[PDB]
Point group: D2
Chain length 497, copies 4
């Protein structure tokens, strides 16, 4: 059958004509019989001296680690990134230093709300995280299949996520939670419109785009800086699943995305993406009609054309999912010299969040895990110990900086870019920033009559289950975007009710 | 709508005019604005001094804990156990001390192989664990919806579960794994047959029975003991779901069981099970045709009649699923005086696995979690400290035993019952015990022509995706149970191929 | 004997009449014999059935939790804080609202470098953390027995602590590490001088002062803010131990401080401190001869007189040390309305560090631990789940903000004080800020001749073990503080060598 | 000076020619300035953008792991084991296959009661754990500097340890707890006599002996078995410290043992031990005057002569203490083919506790830690996943046993030795086995008058602080050993009181 199915068969064949290895305990002690336990008499009790049993059972009892708080359901692959164009004028990052340069990458695709045993083919954003193992350390471009997001302030994220998951008492999905939050926070209108459009359910991972979403900052050798947006378009072309097909598949194969990806790579059909960037000078950001750092807004291509950079290619499957995919950790704060963060509140928050959640999910020394190790760089610092320290722990090197004993030294050229900001240090309300303009353009221009029909149907089909006062609020927001938008949805709601 | 859907609504209503509480941090400090972060200027960077943000974010980052290694997907409810008959001549356990006595209980139903985000209506045995909060500590009767199991030795459990879960490399369900194991371990025939019958997909948790499965031991007031089986028949009657219906619902409502149960209880339709026990004297155990402790065998009702004991009633929904259901922990080892283990190898292994995995999943002091607390009993011992020690840690009471300072004392009446055992201390092979006899009785008499047909197309439907050599090995086992069994399955496989 | 020694006797006596409790397992099951394990025959192997054994052993195996990264060895006590003067013109904090108002407090004293099994009477600063359980949440004033510190930038803290602890290879205290860091980092000159003076080794915890050290911000009801310093003078008078005595006691009774404190409280000698604050207006913060936020500087009493506020009284010993002292956690970030942080880089780093380390050392829900619970406030928010969720997890309350269902609301009045900061966002070097002026005043104006002699003797006695080149740089720094300071030390160094 | 002190200087010198390494974050990103944090202006608050700070600070915050519940304070070293004599007639273990065969070993010496920052030179037994990295996996001989122990049943261990540690309320050493336990459990007399003798405080780890203590079982190539005791005498000779000197050193240098070992190895003075065994046939096991599996009994050399086997040599110091020593784990259950446990109840309990405590202290995958990995063996089994899985996690190999795909197979020649038993599975009382005979031989025949005098002074010196009723009971037991033993002690107690 397919490569995925033949996993064990192929493993067996690669062993060809050779006796199996000796079965041992965790401590390497050979096992004489791992099929029966030690008892006193054929029908007597179990003995504690049956260490083979305890050793195995105890490990079995510890196999699970907390799933990701979000994006728990996913798939992974490996490959490389190749520079096809010269953008050193914008960024001095080693990853882009010269055309033709190849850097190893690790990627993980995923949904968002569903837990580990949920279906792939469901409406939801799609995680598209890329780990670049550069000479200047790891660069994690933790993106999604959408250029924007539901909210513009990180302090609402925990709440947004809660509204998207299970009811605290019933443990069931709750449309009142979903829509009460969205209707109360109309800034989500942009991404909500994108979510309920055709692209809400990509036909697998290979048929969707990737985006850094946030506005990032690039710094060149001269210490000059510009802002940018990262884009990685699918070379396999955009392709989506119909509501009917997605539902059928969620039932027939909940792991459609995993299977698809594995089999494609296994058969030589390596998926690739064309990497681009949008650039905006500091002067332009000052004149941009919206907040250039507002995650609910996009940079119009007409005004900010896509500048080609390279290719993203996935040509290697994982050998052990848990070890290579479940344990992989992407930190947006993982940016090498030449790439920095912008003042986007959402990104700013993610700077803290990811490393934090990883220390809990994987452990303090989660960077020691092979797949997370920045193996194309030499990690040298004054960090020591911590649980599960699986390396030399930097031997006997002086553990304090500064020191007169030859220990690692800071590298001045790697110093960050400095800007002067003005205004008081407080909480600035962004609830009232433009929440409808770009959405209108999306509804009218980016979509056609046919697409606007499905959009409204998808939305009404879910919103119909929220209480009436919530439907009204939601529709009020939609109407604000465009009369036809709100009225079409209400018309459908009317029939459901 | 249904009560489940109206969870938030009712909660709101249950707070009439009552003013909303003040939103505070974890440390209880009031929050002035939890809707915007602190930045330097309207479009400046995030500040560390915004502890409101990190306080909330850090917790969000740590919401997840490892799901159960098995039976991860489930539902929970509470109620009580009431004694209707007098079995004090068999067991002195306080929970049975007198007719009419009620003991608070906690229950959790679940599937087995699927992770946290999987569907309820899938072919899989069903967990049915009952926790009795007695005065002699908690009594955990961790049962299933079947009186038997797939294997008879605990050292094969980890391997079995592995074969039921995802392929190590692809992270996909693997039929070669499932059938290679079962075909290699024919003792599984009995429970496999039950699994692939109509009983494999119950119509929710209320329409299935519960069993302790294992043979346990009861001790009366005179010190005499007998072996027993626990049974709890559904008073709502046995009802199953068809393969089509189950498949449909798995997509329409992956949380069918949680919903059904919550709603039944929320509408006053409290589900109940009649509690029975089977009794086998030590003498009868000598003559029983098979190993009375072999978990793949049942005690024929004809020879061992069900003795009514009481009722299990579920009249209360959990208020917070995570705290009351996700965190609940059942240990088969939790048995009060009057109820003891039997030499069943599988039960013996479970005496270790449960609290062991619990110390990992929940933590060292998992018994401190409210839902796991033996609240109807006074916990007094010499155990101290441990992570997250939420209690007075037993104050300044002497922490060693024995002691001359009045600390807790062991009670002679709590001494366990002794059984004489003799023979060699070694691993006795049980792979060759009877694997077909009882199975044949089920295929031939418990099932009719119509059911046998479904059983075979259910098996063949899954087995067909396994390699031919595995198919043949499987059919041979079935042929040994009954020529018709094997030949009917082979016939369906042939057309599938 | 002393009350501490008679702990068990008094406990035994408090139960005079009373029959001893039943010894149970963790789940509350009575134990018949907890003095003998279950074996097959008198000289047979141990059986897994012995859950009594396993249950207890498993908990003993998990008694230990990581000690504090710094300040590991300590002592705790409880009492109250009583307002004696009116400072509402400076702060609106409820803890200060009315003269005579009492607020329960928890306190923990400690050394810094030594691990849990180290001696109390050693040269090292002393921790003096105070937890105020207020109606506006807990307020943690995590101070030391000194008004200043060794460094003025938090990013150097880990290295500093490293240099103060064990050598990474030898696990031995390393004077080369100690002095290389200090000589390379002359900001330490001020605190080093305090450290090696007579107050380096207080005669117990009751004879030392307490300081908030950092500059903090106070806000009154009108929104006006001022900077401040917190001081808590010992009412028992300052009393130190001679180098000779401290050494003898470190051997005779490593737990001198714990014992002293316990007996003092046990015998009615309740220690108290007089609470004061120094105030500096934003206007005065401009003219100050030094950086008012530099932790290596103090505010001269002449220019900023101590203003009396209240009393700190300790009148209750811990009932269980582990539960109330080892598990206690103080977070400088725990500040209620009316009390805020200043731009002191050091304080700013601690804002993150404490809660971070607590989630590791204790666990994600450490605030659930009784002693850490802000029990005089109603914790109401949108944070849920996490390991060891010991409270009702806020039941079924809507878990997302904002919401239309009545869940907790933010109270605007608690908003923080906003200030306009000017300058570029970058790393500003502060290594060269005045490192001697105040140090010289201390040497010349605060101490007398015999005190200067001891200071030098103490410094030289420890410095003499560092390499000559380190001794030179160290002496060069002291000489810059005052020519007679450096020469005196050099003279002593000369003979020890 | 000494090698230990010159640790850093030597490290620097080794790096003679070489630019220092580039200072990086955990992710391997070069750091431009790790001496100043990012703030808004020279006197502004800290920014979240400073991931350099958070990265380092967060790891510092997690440096600590739980100390060993017992034997927390210790020292480690490495070397080898060389077989000098042929004992293959008794055991088939590969570690003994031929004369001259060397196996790498890892050793850790330690005290027992004291925590991490406690002193080395104090009365307490000494841990002498030896890890042998054999081809048949790791063999852990977790010994002590004594052939016997305080108790004979593992269920009293938690309590014993509790009495030896700190009072639960005061957190102080409690002689009432110490002696109440010992006086109530007279079986401790034998080891208490050893502990309070001159060997109670050995001069460093090199001048003490080591013993496996328990009775173990050896099996040869043709399944014949005999019982044995492991002995390893110091080739540096027995050397102890006087009470006065031990007290002084505990103040002058708490890390005395650590320093002694390091410098000794650093200067080429490699400490060695001569390894022997005592052999008792199954028939002699019947004739032995006492229970040969009683931990409080020794095998008289006259009847069971020491049989030379090999040498233990420590020639390598740790490079990183935390990594090689603090994280090292010894499990008595780690026994390769040829060496097995005996029915010694204490040993049977240790079979469980150790792997168990390690899963808590280090982590589920603690065997993956370099110093714990059985590197001279091919670990092949069916164990997968778990926190911090730092290897290939065995790749895509079939994860279930049995299978038809060439995965690891059990090896029939590695089956344990089977013995016949007969008796009730119950708790047999051993509290009344002989508790004085061998102790008398020690007091009378082994010690001379000086030593008995010192022994009594040592006991009384500590015992005098317990309550008289405890003193009397303790003396009664000593009197049961010998009239002179009790009278001499009583005479001293009279004086102290
Ligand atoms: C920027 C530098 C600092 C950092 C990063 C820092 C970090 C820490 C950490 C991580 C702990 C252990 C906390 C626990 O596990 O409970 C600790 C404890 C402590 N620190 Fe700091 N600290 C710093 C500066 C100071 C200063 C300047 C003071 C006093 C004003 C101070 C006083 C204390 C005290 C008293 C404790 C012990 C609390 C207890 O008894 O539980 N620290 N510190
Ligand atoms: C992130 N989701
Ligand atoms: C159990 N499963
Ligand atoms: C804090 N030290
Ligand atoms: C063992 N200690």
């Amino acid at each position: 059958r397919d490569p995925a199915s033949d996993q064990m068969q192929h493993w067996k064949e690669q062993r060809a004509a050779q006796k199996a290895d000796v079965l041992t305990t965790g401590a390497g002690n050979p096992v004489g019989d791992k099929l029966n336990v030690i008892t006193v008499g054929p029908r007597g009790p179990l003995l504690v001296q049956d260490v083979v049993f305890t050793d195995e059972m105890a490990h079995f009892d510890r196999e699970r680690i907390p799933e990701r708080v979000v994006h728990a359901k996913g798939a992974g692959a490996f490959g490389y990134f190749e520079v096809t164009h010269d953008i050193t004028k914008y960024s001095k990052a080693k990853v882009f230093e010269h055309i033709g340069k190849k850097t190893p990458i690790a990627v993980r695709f995923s949904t968002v709300a569903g837990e580990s045993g949920s279906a792939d083919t469901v409406r939801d954003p799609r995680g598209f995280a890329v780990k670049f193992y550069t000479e200047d350390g790891n660069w994690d471009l933790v993106g999604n299949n959408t250029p924007i997001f539901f909210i513009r302030d990180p302090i609402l994220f925990p709440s947004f996520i809660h509204s998207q998951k299970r009811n605290p008492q019933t443990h069931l999905k709750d449309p009142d939670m979903v829509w009460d939050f969205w209707s109360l926070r109309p800034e989500s209108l942009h991404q909500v419109s994108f979510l309920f459009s055709d692209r809400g359910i990509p036909d697998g991972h290979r048929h969707m785009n990737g985006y850094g979403s946030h506005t990032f900052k690039l710094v060149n050798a001269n210490g000059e800086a510009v802002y940018c947006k990262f884009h990685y378009k699918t070379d396999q072309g955009i392709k989506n699943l119909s509501v009917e097909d997605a539902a059928r598949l969620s039932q027939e194969d909940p792991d459609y995305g995993i299977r698809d990806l594995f089999n494609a790579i296994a058969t030589g059909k390596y998926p690739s993406w064309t990497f681009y960037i949008q650039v905006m000078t500091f002067n332009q950001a000052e004149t941009f009609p919206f907040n250039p750092f507002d995650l609910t807004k996009v940079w119009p291509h007409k005004d900010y054309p896509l500048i080609p950079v390279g290719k993203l290619v996935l040509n290697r499957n994982p050998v052990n999912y848990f070890a290579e995919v479940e344990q992989i950790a992407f930190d947006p704060s993982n940016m090498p010299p030449g790439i920095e963060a912008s003042p986007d509140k959402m990104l700013q928050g993610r700077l803290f969040a990811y490393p934090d959640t990883h220390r809990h999910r994987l452990g303090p020394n989660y960077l020691h895990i092979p797949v997370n190790c920045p193996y194309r760089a030499r990690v040298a610092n004054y960090q020591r110990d911590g649980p599960m320290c699986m390396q030399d722990n930097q031997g006997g090197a002086p553990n304090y900086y500064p020191n007169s004993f030859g220990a690692p030294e800071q590298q001045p050229s790697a110093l960050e870019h400095s800007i002067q900001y003005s205004g008081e240090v407080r909480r600035f309300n962004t609830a009232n920033d433009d929440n409808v303009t770009q959405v209108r353009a999306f509804y009218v221009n980016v979509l056609n009559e046919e697409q606007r029909k499905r959009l409204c149907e998808n939305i009404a089909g879910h919103l119909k289950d929220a209480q009436i006062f919530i439907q009204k609020k939601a529709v009020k927001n939609f109407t604000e975007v465009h009369p036809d938008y709100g009225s079409h949805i209400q018309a459908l709601l009317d029939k459901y009710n």
